[PDB]
Every structure is written in C-alpha cells, then in structure tokens.
C-alpha cells in the first residue's frame, strides 16, 4: 500500500495518483479543491477553500 | 436579387471580418447566459482563466490586472452567477441571458379622459419628466 | 571562531531545508511516462485474467491486465488501477469509499460530557439498552430469537433536548459517529443522494461500532397525496433506496437508526413500521427532577455568589426547555455587564425567568 490518495477532477473524472510531494501533509483534506495538468494529472495550483458558491448573491458596502 | 450581390462585398469584406478573429484562432469560433471559453488559451497572479459550467469549474481570489489585453477566446467573460466580476479589460458584462423580453417603441396613445385628469397627470409628470427638466431643485 | 561555530550548524539545517524540498518534486519530473491512472472496479469475470470493469470516470472501457499482481484481489468489489493510453491494470488499490465531508463527517462523536439537556433517567438509559447489548454480548435476543431492534425515534421541537442528544449519548459510547446532513445529500445536479449513503455503510461492515444519525429531517415526510410536484417526486423515489437497508440483505444490529421530525404529521408510515421505529424519545415539561441535571451544569458556567435558591425558579418555569433555561442567565447576565460585576442575585435571574415566558411561541 504505502502512501497514496485519490483526487476527482471538476470533470467528473477520477484518477488516483502515488505519494506525491507537491503538497503537505496538513493540505490534505476530504472535499479540498486543487489543480492538476490538462494530461498527466499532477497538483500544480491549489484552489481556495470554500466549495461551489459562496453566498450567491452579496452586496459588499464598509 | 439585392441579396446575390450584396454578397459579393461580404465575402470579401469576411475575411476583413475574419480579420478580428485573427486575433484568436483557438478553439474554432455581449448577451450571455454564463461566461464560457475554451481553455482561455491567452489568459499575486498574472493570467486568469475562469469558467463556470457542467466541466472544469475554475475559481479566482485575485484579479484587476492585464493579462489578456481586451477580449480573449470564447469573447464571453464576465458578470454571470453574479459572484463573478472581470472588470479591467472592457468587459461584456452585466448583458440579458436567455429570457423573455417583451421591448417594443413608441406606444402611442393620444387623450382619454381629462375630465378628473387635470391635476392629476401633472402627478404624473412630477414622476417621469420632472427629473427629466430641473433636476437642480 | 566560535561565532561561525553556531551558524554553520543552522546553515547545515537550512540545507536540509534547501534541499528535501525539490527533491520530492524530482520524482515527478521522471513520472511524465506514467499518467495519472483512472479510476476503476471489477464487476463480472469474464475471460481468464482481463474482466469487465466500467471505469466511473467515463463510460465503459475494458482495458488488459497486468501480471505484477495476481487474480486473488481481482475479484468483485474492489478499486482497481487502470491506464488511460495502453488500458491496462496496473497495481491493486485498496478499496476506497471516498471519505468527503457529507460521506465521514470530519467532526466524530464529541469533545463534550454527559447530558446538558438531559435529566430525564427513564428515557435516556431506555435507549442505552438497545445500544450497547449487541456491543458486548448478544446472547439476550439468542434466547429470544428476535432480531436487534435499531428502532429509535424522536419528536418534538428541534434543537431542544433533542438534537444534541447525537453528539453527547452517543459520543461516550465510544463508537463511530458519522454526521449524515439532509442538505449535503441533495445534490441538486444528478442527484446520487441514496447511493451516497450506500457507500457509507461499507464502514459498518469494516468498524462494528458504527453510529448513524439522521438530524432533523421533514423534507422526507410530506408524501404527498395530489403528488403534483415536481423535484420532490425524486425524493419519495430516493426514500424507497434508505428502506432498503432496513428490508434487504443488511442485517448488522450495530448502526442504529435516529429519525428526527418537527411534527407528526403526513410522514411515511412505512418507516413508522414498529420494526424500523421502536423507542419514541417525546420532549415534555417535566418536574425539577428532570431539570435539575441541567441546573447543575447550569450553575457551574455562571460564577456568582455563593447564596441563591433555585427550588423557587421550578415553579416559575411554564414551556421552558434545555434552551430556555440558558436563556435565563444569559439575559439575567446581561443586566450585569454595566454593573462591573459577574455576580447574579437570584432574584436578578427569576426576572428573566419571566422575561421568557412573554416571548414564548
């Protein structure tokens, strides 16, 4: 077994992927969203928290 | 036969035309309902490349900066989902999705009735072209 | 010298920073000759090694086999590797349920003690027994000769005695407490919603002590009786796959099944069956005897003199619950912040006994 994880892209697409370093260990999280090449599948850059939508509608006033 | 020559001006000027879509040649070829485009090939942060739809939903923090240079790709980015704001390079944005519109002009009514009318469509006109004449008061 | 001596020895280290570091990257600069596999499950054996596996990610491709690994954890029910380009498997993963947020919630069983909305002995130890006799040993229901009864029910106002039951009974029974919310199961787009839960069972199989708690739910309770809806037809549809686990093959006696509703009202009676429901769990008003576990931890919170008598505020309470009765020194304690003092006279507190009776419904 070792050291390995599962990653779904957005494209309904899932691909499993070996222990990888581009990431650390308290970045990984159930639901986290990330980034990964257009072919080779490899995290490159991590989205932000929040998934889907935030608040759908706002009005921003300080 | 308006239309068989006016053609003849058209494919040529097509191309001028097509001149425009030089610009982007990627992915084959402003109201819009969501903001879409095929991999936003042309693009702190420099390139942004957003799309929202059933494949690659894409997110971005930052942003009011030039990468693109004016239009990109697919042509259409910007308000939709609300949420969503490109902004800096003239944006095709806050634009009617798809729905139902009824626009018509000129609908011309002349006087009905100015019996008990008198004074009151001069409150009508306080409504619409009060503001429309001296708006300094 | 020596002052070089000690920062060397932290230029060593920053090395070592400097250095592990890319090192993993490396690895995955050699790795663009394998692409990221998809994902994949035997189903139906087929010819000697290559079987019929449909890869989710996409529709149905059988791809070749590999001989690193053998035809012994090639069999159904499992997560395979398969290539993209040469469609081949390539190693044997483990099977995966996919632990999201709404599939193990993240927050199990609970940082808190016992009861703070309890009190009540009969009720809540009347729960405990259908709970941990199969924990230990299930030779009573042997004798008996009747299946473990998962029955539990519970109705009345939300959030009062009754919701945070979950997150402290069931917290020290020292068992797996897997949050299953009604609105992440929704799932507007394609709704998998029941096979999502499906899938969740396979830690019960797995890990024995496996609670399951349903918060709250009356989106499934309305049938419907004119059925004009429109995306709520989905949901008595998606209703019938949840009675399957409690009709078909599943048979366990250690996840238990807590259904909670505001109203009895036109909810499915199929899932009222005195099999599926058995103990109903009602919120009454009950004498000090039942609140006066709460008064404890209630009093405990709140630092004030030493000199109070609470036997008096009982009588004064009239539709108060587990949260009215925070509400009491939560007011009460709001007329003493421009006081300057933390102290709460007992009459200070009954004045806001009162004050929750006029807002009360």
Redesign the interface.
Same mark, same amino acid.
């Given at each position: 077994?070792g050291k390995?994880a599962?990653? $779904? *892209?957005?494209?309904?697409? *899932?691909?499993?992927?070996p222990m990888?370093?581009?990431v650390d260990p308290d970045k990984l999280k159930?639901?986290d969203?990330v980034g990964?090449n257009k072919?080779?599948? /490899?995290i490159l850059d991590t /989205?932000?928290s929040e998934f889907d939508?935030?608040v $759908?509608?706002?009005e921003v006033d300080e | 036969l308006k239309q068989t020559e006016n053609d003849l001006k058209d494919i040529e000027a097509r191309i001028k035309e097509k001149a425009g879509v030089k610009e982007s040649d990627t992915g084959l070829a402003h109201p819009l309902q969501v903001a879409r485009c095929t991999k936003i090939i042309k693009g702190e942060d420099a390139k942004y490349v957003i799309n929202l739809k059933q494949i690659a939903k894409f997110v971005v923090g930052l942003g009011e900066r030039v990468s693109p240079t004016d239009i990109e790709e697919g042509m259409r980015v910007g308000v939709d989902r609300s949420k969503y704001n490109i902004e800096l390079p003239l944006p095709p944005r806050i634009d009617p999705s798809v729905t139902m519109m009824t626009v018509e002009e000129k609908p011309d009514v002349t006087y009905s009735d100015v019996g008990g009318c008198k004074d009151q469509i001069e409150k009508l006109r306080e409504v619409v072209e009060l503001p429309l004449l001296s708006p300094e008061r | 010298h020596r002052r070089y001596d000690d920062q060397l020895k932290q230029r060593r280290q920053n090395i070592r920073d400097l250095e592990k570091l890319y090192d993993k990257t490396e690895n995955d600069i050699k790795a663009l000759q394998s692409i990221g596999q998809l994902i994949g499950e035997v189903m139906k054996e087929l010819s000697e090694e290559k079987y019929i596996v449909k890869a989710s990610s996409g529709p149905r491709y059988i791809v070749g086999v590999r001989n690193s690994v053998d035809r012994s954890k090639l069999k159904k029910g499992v997560r395979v590797t398969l290539d993209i380009t040469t469609l081949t498997i390539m190693r044997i993963l483990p099977r995966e349920t996919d632990p999201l947020v709404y599939n193990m919630t993240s927050f199990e069983q609970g940082e808190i003690t016992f009861d703070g909305i309890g009190g009540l002995t009969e009720q809540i130890r009347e729960l405990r027994e259908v709970i941990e006799l199969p924990l230990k040993n299930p030779e009573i229901f042997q004798r008996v000769g009747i299946k473990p009864p998962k029955g539990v029910l519970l109705y009345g106002p939300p959030g009062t005695g009754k919701t945070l039951l979950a997150k402290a009974v069931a917290a020290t029974i020292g068992a797996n407490f897997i949050f299953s919310p009604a609105s992440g199961i929704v799932d507007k787009y394609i709704g998998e919603s029941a096979r999502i839960i499906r899938e969740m069972f396979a830690y019960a199989k797995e890990h024995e002590p496996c609670i399951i708690f349903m918060d709250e739910v009356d989106a499934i309770g309305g049938r419907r009786f004119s059925e004009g809806t429109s995306a709520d037809r989905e949901i008595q549809r998606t209703l019938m796959e949840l009675l399957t686990q409690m009709d078909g093959f599943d048979n366990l006696g250690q996840t238990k099944i807590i259904m909670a509703t505001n109203r009895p009202d036109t909810l499915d009676p199929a899932l009222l069956r005195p099999g599926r429901l058995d103990r109903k769990v009602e919120i009454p008003l009950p004498n000090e005897a039942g609140r006066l576990e709460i008064f404890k931890i209630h009093t405990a919170k709140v630092k004030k003199t030493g000199e109070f008598d609470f036997e008096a505020a009982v009588k004064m309470s009239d539709g108060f619950n587990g949260a009215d009765i925070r509400n009491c020194a939560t007011e009460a304690g709001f007329f003493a912040i421009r006081d300057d003092r933390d102290h709460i006279n007992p009459d200070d507190l009954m004045k806001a006994v009162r004050k929750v009776a006029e807002v009360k419904k």
């Open positions: 077994v390995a599962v990653v $779904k *892209t957005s494209s309904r697409q *899932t691909v499993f992927l990888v370093g581009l159930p639901n969203l990964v072919d080779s599948y /490899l /989205l932000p939508s935030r $759908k509608a706002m | - | -």
